[model samples]
Target: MVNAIRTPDQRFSNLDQYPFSPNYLDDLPGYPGLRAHYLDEGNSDAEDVFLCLHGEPTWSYLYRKMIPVFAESGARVIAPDFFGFGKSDKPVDEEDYTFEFHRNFLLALIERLDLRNITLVVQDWGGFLGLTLPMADPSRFKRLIIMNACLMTDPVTQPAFSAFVTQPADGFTAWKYDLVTPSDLRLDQFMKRWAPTLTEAEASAYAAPFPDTSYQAGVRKFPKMVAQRDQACIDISTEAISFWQNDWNGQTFMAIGMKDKLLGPDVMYPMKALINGCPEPLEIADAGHFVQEFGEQVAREALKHFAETE
Candidate 1:
């Protein structure tokens, strides 16, 4: 019933370096009339599932470099494009995109697909949202692959983030104002600014989801949502902190992109400390916020670490 628009399939056609077939779900509970997209690769029956969730302004394409690596390791790799980002439906109204809105969609997707023994791969908004999921059904999740992300629950824990998150709109209104008035040049500028080594084709793949300003409701609203401290984010993150600290018995592999000005080692170190037995991360000295750009290397090191631990 939510009014939304679907990006044309042609926009995604022949995207460079992303050749995975698209999978769709239209009947996810509570998400009527909206189509969600995801890439389901490797063995369907595989007991270990790599559930890669993307963040704002990006989609499953972010995991192109990592998906195959996880899949090749005899595990199912499922990377979902949150409703507004990839081949999924985009709610035209910015207000329609909320933390709970996005969070519930993920919960529904996991339940719908019955994804179990998950290795939750998360970053950015993916970390923001995905990190809160396991407590919903801790039995379904078995491990975590964290990068460039944090649970912004304790304002005292990270004063830098506390100052940032407490600000009115966190400058998101201005930022969204800039993005809702779209331009391909601006899109290219964003990609280059965040992931400079990305080839033109890969950049194009990142931009493919939003063919125009109309397709950006999710993008424009995500930052605004980030600034709005949902009590749920606090409650769940607080609980998750306890779970990771005392209850979680799963293996954890963390990767840090040392150059990330936003959530680099300063942010991630605290998060690493929160996990029960998270190992020292596989540090990518040159990578930025979107560390998945160096996904292949991260995936390789992660598999090696997990294998050694096992």
Candidate 2:
């Protein structure tokens, strides 16, 4: 049995601007006794489903600005928090957070929920794991909303996609503490750098899941899970690329945060080229790595494009 830590409910209380009710699934096969948290809003029976997957160090809170927009348009919005982040149970051992662990959990969640006609929204590690999902069951998904992310394959040849492989694991280890302590000042500082207009409450919402150090095992292990050319995940992502390039028939929307130092235009353009029929992206000039910080505008534009097109 894997040891895990569940954050206190009080830590999430009074989050600024976040008022969505928490939805939990505790009996997913293989995840017995572990609870997964998600935000499920709008018409559960809606034919069009918007699945917004959050990256490392962030949770369903990251999609706060976008969820309402999709719901307002009459689409069901499902944003799930990966284990160890947001309201999901956090495994105590860093080793327990593996690429397969995360991937399996998501696949299980998708099956259990029977999500179909999905409009997949992804960024950061969201793309890392999410971009590979269609290959598992292509018919379930119908569209893609990709932002500041790429499939890690042939890292040596695909330098832009491989950039994540170079991030220092030690840096992430040190940074996890800042996500939970001292009023989450470090998280605020980091968010403000990318999103200068971010309110204090918004920053606190991002830190709400990590009540303390024990709740950060997933955050600390995520960087280490990035797929390198030599890693096993790269092989799986390589297959996903083939699926997207040749088999995917869904409409796609690409968005770029021009100022994103980690995975901006340099990386996104290449990814756009890889998708079967992805169109020109909507570029946010002043936005940074956490592109969802500008999600309100991005969400509106994406809905408009999908509405006007085939």
Candidate 3:
């Protein structure tokens, strides 16, 4: 069992615009003694499951705006906080938070819950990881709602696609730099820099999970892995590119955070072109890296697109 700590429930007493109940699973295969937290909203029996996956440093709360909109569409919304973020168990050791460890958790969660007919909503590390999941069990995922994210592939053989992994100094270089350089990640202040529109309470909620530096191993590890694409996630991501390009038959919706310096138009456009059948992106000029900040409009427009297509 990994030595992990759970954020005090008191820290989450009241959050702005986040009025959802918590659902947790302490027993998923491979993840021994670690509890995972997810928000299960809308109809549990709903056929279309909107699996909302958040990225580095953010949790299920990132999907707050989108979740309600998805739920209102009469679809199920399941947003999970990867271990070390939100209310999930945080492994105290940085080494314990590996790419495979996080990836495997999602696989386990899917199987354990038997989630099917998924509309995968992703951004940032959420996209890097969640985008690869459908090919693993292609039948379960039906549609995708991609936002401000890209794949992580082998930098050498797949240089163009691997730009995200080996991002330029002008892009993710500065982004990841901010992530690691901060000795103590005051997520509230840090988040505001990336998503300038966040209210004071929203920023504070982002910091709620990590009371101190001891609770930040996962946050630090994410940026480090990107710098060293030597990580094997490259191989899996390389395979995922093939899956999205050749075999995928699912519908796709791409939303770009135009102000996102890390994965803006340059990053999202290539990703849109790569996903076979992906349509023109819904560009949100005001939103930055965390596109979910303006998720309400994205959600409404995305649902309209999917409904119209159907």
Candidate 4:
């Protein structure tokens, strides 16, 4: 049975099952009164573990195509829904969400799970929140797969990101709903290509997790966090990179999206400089800011190869 919290509507049955039966939500003791949702898959005795983290306006469902492959390859796969998104609870007020709150939330969950030998698959806000946590506790991770993401602090440094955050557009709120599907698609064309994979029901399932505007606090706040260059976030990410340089060496792979206007290859230069050298930086040609939408297959393959090879 698929256990879900707070949603009365069941548009799609066990959206988690699209990947596999992920061992569902288990409340973390450190965070009282909060339940965290995740999928724990693969062999009981698997030595290697894959921890896939998703970004804003998206959930673990982004890894739906990749999770099963890793699970089948004898590596344990884990993906969590950050609070206020997916199967997790949404606090009504904007104050309920913060960069620090999410950082601490993931920290609590990681400690609760006692996850080790983990390869972290991070993107977008996942890079923002997920990468920093493991960097703070460097012993938890083995390798990292980063795609179309950044850990930069200055808004001046990332002009495109600044524009994206400040853009006066309501449509930005409904990206997965509005942009994922093209109205020009014919029924047969849709069914053959994008239809069965992303049915209207599944689309509803994705959006259903966020029922109202109040739950969108995290979504709005995430971009704001990117613009923060003076706070603890800036300091923390800087410190994390220092630790990464001194300790976490060649275990990181930078898979960027060439067509990403939001977070282009230029951002990786500072990051690569910090790491000393990041090998053969991969790029998906046709992808944009939401690279995973256009390049998930290539991204998945690159991730699997990165995980297994070294």
Candidate 5:
């Protein structure tokens, strides 16, 4: 296992244990030498390279259940924790985070790894960041399997989508937090359900990045970053949308969560129409917004087939 770079408070020291093959962490431009974490699975001789990116408040652990299956099938899977989530370096200030910063961080990671003909499995913010990375350099990825995600430039362009982004002000967080956990599920439940099955040490390894609520400035601000109209965020997204519109090859696929109220069909339908590249929708019947947990097995099986066949 690759040894961890200690964070400010060692939040990961007391985590639950589970086995994890060591992944690489590296610094990039724009973020000024800040480090990002990522996992490289399977041997290098594999033909297709799979890059799975997670969304807000979640990390590469989201792909744990699905990785081994893909690896067993002779595919190299690369799942990276975003700058602040998972076992990555968390920036101390919320100001250090932005949509563009994320985009650049991912772009750099891709270039650093020198990946090609990759299959991108993206969810939530992953859709925006992952899709945009390839848009920056179309040769970086070959196909996209998008699930419960959006890559829009203007939130106001889609009223339902706009409202969904702004819903946190109306208690969306509390509603989601309460709804995700059952009466029997608590903090431990979060550890078990939110992350892929982990041993005690592995769980601790996952939590090592976020030392406290302060360190969580990135995760907490992720939603806010989505809604911001600032130059960095807006410029990158707007440029990306323009590029997508002009040259969107028929390489994008949509696997939607049928039960997701916030970012389900209502929002995704417009995206599909707008892109015109993704026509058919692969619907997950039993999933909600956090479908990664509720629809784990279904997502795994469906995505596995999609990756293999698509």
Candidate 6:
């Protein structure tokens, strides 16, 4: 029913440091015929599931460093690219991308996989949407590894959440401007600029999905959706704040990319406070917005923390 384009398999050939086999589902309930890409690692029946969610202009490639670590620990790991990014189908229409469209697809995917005992992992747009997931199916989510992400609550009541979208000089404002202003958005250059630590090949992997701008409708719309939080998303986010503050009894490990201009301590600290049992964040002093770039250490530390607490 949706007009979407799939990134050719050849474009993804010989990616550096990404060795996971692709698993896809083209019949995720409402998402009929749209092939969604995900990485299924570790033991298929492992009790613990690490559901890694990537954010804007990035895909499952964002978790390359951390996925192996999680899987090696004997836990099943799942990292899925949202419809527009990575190996998944990209809807050609910008209007086809909405808060609900992305969110609902996540919900449907979780159900389709029958996932449980989830250790939800998120950052960036991953946090905006991933943090809100537990309230929908609290029983399935058992832990959280939050890095540089915040709930998309109502701007009227949530100043910290609102400030980035509203402030003219804020880092996120400038970041969004840079992303939206570019017509042929070169993702490799974009990733290199933001992450700064990425090698040339690592950067090219980020750009592999879109050969041209026509394949970038989903990429272009993400910033706008975050900047323009619709009422429905606001209500969901507002409610999620309560869920984290009260209903969340699971272990929480927070990590902050200290150099992240977009959602640094200003955004993440407030986010940490809202999470009931969230520990003080593991600060990656040199890392920026894409904290997963430094994820091997973060994953090890988080697993260590969870072990100590459990």
Largest TM-score belongs to which candidate? 6
Q: lDDT for model 5, on a 0 to 1 scale?
A: 0.65
Measured with C-alpha atoms, the lDDT of residue 195 in candidate 4 is 23
- Candidate 2, residues 51-77, lDDT tens digits: the string is 999996789888888899999999999
Residue-wise C-alpha lDDT for candidate 1, range 196-288, written one tens digit per residue = 888888888878888787888888777666666677767776777777888878899999988776677777888898888998888899898
RMSD of each: 2.7, 3.2, 1.4, 6.1, 5.4, 1.0
lDDT of 4 by residue, 1-310 (tens): 1222343335335453364553444456545566677878788568878788888667777677677777767888888888767676665555566777778888877777788888888878888777687666777788777777667554654343345444434323333223334333122222223223455544554565655454555555554556554477777776676665676754777777675545557655555556534666777776555555543574467666675676
By TM-score, the candidates rank as 6, 3, 1, 2, 5, 4
Q: In model 5, what lDDT does residue 153 have?
A: 61
lDDT of 6 by residue, 187-207 (tens): 899888888999999999999
Candidate 2 clash pair list: none
Q: Candidate 1 or 5, higher TM-score?
A: 1
Give the per-residue lDDT of model 5 (tens digit) for 159-263.
Answer: 644667556543344434533333332333344444334445554554456554555666666666655657655556666666656776736666777766667
Sliding window of 10 residues with minimal summed lDDT for model 1: 166-175
Model 3 Cα lDDT, one tens digit per residue, 165-184: 44567567777777788887
Deviation in angstroms for 295 in model 5? 6.4
What's model 1's lDDT at 121?
Answer: 95
User: How much does candidate 6 score in TM-score?
Assistant: 0.98
| Global lDDT scores for all candidate models | 0.83, 0.82, 0.88, 0.62, 0.65, 0.91
Q: What is the lDDT of residue 101 in candidate 4?
A: 77
* Candidate 6: count of backbone clashes, pairs at least 3 residues apart or interchain: 0
Query: For candidate 6, what is the lDDT?
Result: 0.91
Give model 1 RMSD, 1 decimal.
Answer: 2.7
lDDT of 1: 0.83
Model 2: lDDT to the true structure: 0.82
Cα error of candidate 3 at position 110, Å: 0.5
Q: Rank the candidates by lDDT, best first.
A: 6, 3, 1, 2, 5, 4
Q: Give residue 252's lDDT in candidate 1 (0 to 100).
A: 93
In candidate 6, position 35 carries an lDDT of 95
